[PDB]
Amino acid sequence: HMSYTWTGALITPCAAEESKLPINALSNSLLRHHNMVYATTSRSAGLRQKKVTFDRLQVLDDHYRDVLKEMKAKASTVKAKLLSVEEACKLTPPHSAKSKFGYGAKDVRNLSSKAVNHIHSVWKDLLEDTVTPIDTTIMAKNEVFCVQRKPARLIVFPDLGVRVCEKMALYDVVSTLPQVVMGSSYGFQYSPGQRVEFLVNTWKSKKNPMGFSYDTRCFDSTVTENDIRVEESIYQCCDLAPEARQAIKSLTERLYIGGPLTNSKGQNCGYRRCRASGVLTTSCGNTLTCYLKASAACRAAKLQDCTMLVNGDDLVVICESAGTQEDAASLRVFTEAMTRYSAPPGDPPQPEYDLELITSCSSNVSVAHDASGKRVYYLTRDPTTPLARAAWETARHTPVNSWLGNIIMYAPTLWARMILMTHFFSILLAQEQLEKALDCQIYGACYSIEPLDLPQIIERLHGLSAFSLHSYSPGEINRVASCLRKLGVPPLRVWRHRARSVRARLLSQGGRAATCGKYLFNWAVKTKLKLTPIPAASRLDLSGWFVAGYSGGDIYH
């Protein structure tokens, strides 16, 4: 029962790979310690292969089957529809990997004849053949970190023609089913404002709260054939067209359960019997399987008044404390149960009695004060990786702009406002590119976003208080200051000074640019404008935001 078998062929790059931080004239204004930042490359793929390759053992008890029965009962209330070829085509990212069969992502989006023709042949084949393993490409992801060096993560995906077919069969299912089955525990339904409120209200709902995050070592590799057949049984509980059932069975047997791995040169690298990281059902599958195992493990452990929050493989549990000793015992049982279910821990779980000390979806709750002095909770994180990536994106154009996703998701934080907003608007001013739409990724989906829309986007996700926060916590101030020292980033007093300049320049231009100056940089000026609700921030179409997760799912909105 091995996650992978290997031939010995190497995982190969598609193009040249830089590992050292590229430097330009803008670099030093963000960060001086350039040797701290690196990107992963295929050169480390072998170490990752070793990490992700292990034997899985699975022992399944009555708690597991009881939870599954209840999930299936909820799944049976879902009705999902087939997407048409063109609906599915318009969900494809413009810079998605081209097909091996002589067509690309733009041909798919234009509904060109050769793309549409091939897609129909793949669909027909899915319907006739439920046995032949489908080919996947395996690649090393190039991602940017700060030192303490990780090996490249691996992405496994099928051909573009198959991906469009997955959308036809499954897009409506993976978008709709998770919230029906998990209700309030499904994380991807929440904007950042709604996530913080949920965590705080849950913490507050317990007489004596205790919470913990659970880190599964290599979740994707822990997913067994059983787990993936179990997901399919859940999907099949939905009210589906007969053609959708046949396609889902087929993709399950031929793709989701496993298949051969091919490098960028077309050589055979080996074989997969675990979760593929680049299929449509990666996020929904991981979410269902994480929630199933964790729910069953909560019962095994006898945790009292358990509330879970689940985003794929990321899990937080908040419950009633039974004292520090019985809590420690409960968590050992939880971890033994997950372990028997094929989800052993990386870092073993710790009981926490302070909400601010729990990290989940790479983020912790912290507290600041708005214009009225009233306390507001908001989500933050250690800004090291966000700033290392902004350093890279200062000297190189990248298809996805992490600085922009980070401003969107962490708008209330002191580091996003002072450093990220200041640095990148100054860059957009100097190049006259304020009006140019940029791509970023939120909950695995790709979005085209106009930066001049940032203030409306932020008021909607966070509320106006995001533009007025002050008096941040000492732990948060210390973590930021600590990151600025490590990376060699200029002090917050230098950023305030630049932000005054950026602000005044934005005000000069009027329109949406002036509104950015006013809302985004109100913190920079000695005596503040009283900010009021933005007119445009009621007209933005944020539908298709905070519905579901789509990690590796090749989704564009």
Ligand SMILES: CS(=O)(=O)Nc1ccc2c(c1)S(=O)(=O)C=C(c1c(O)c3cc(F)ccc3n(Cc3ccc(F)cc3)c1=O)N2
């Ligand atoms: C592979 S899996 O099994 O599905 N696991 C998985 C777990 C979490 C997660 C994703 C996948 S995602 O790929 O769907 C993107 C986010 C994810 C983002 O796309 C995101 C983007 C930003 F630009 C800034 C912060 C972000 N945060 C942190 C965050 C989450 C929620 C908040 F309210 C605020 C920050 C995320 O977790 N979360």
Ligand code: NI
């Ligand atoms: Ni029972």
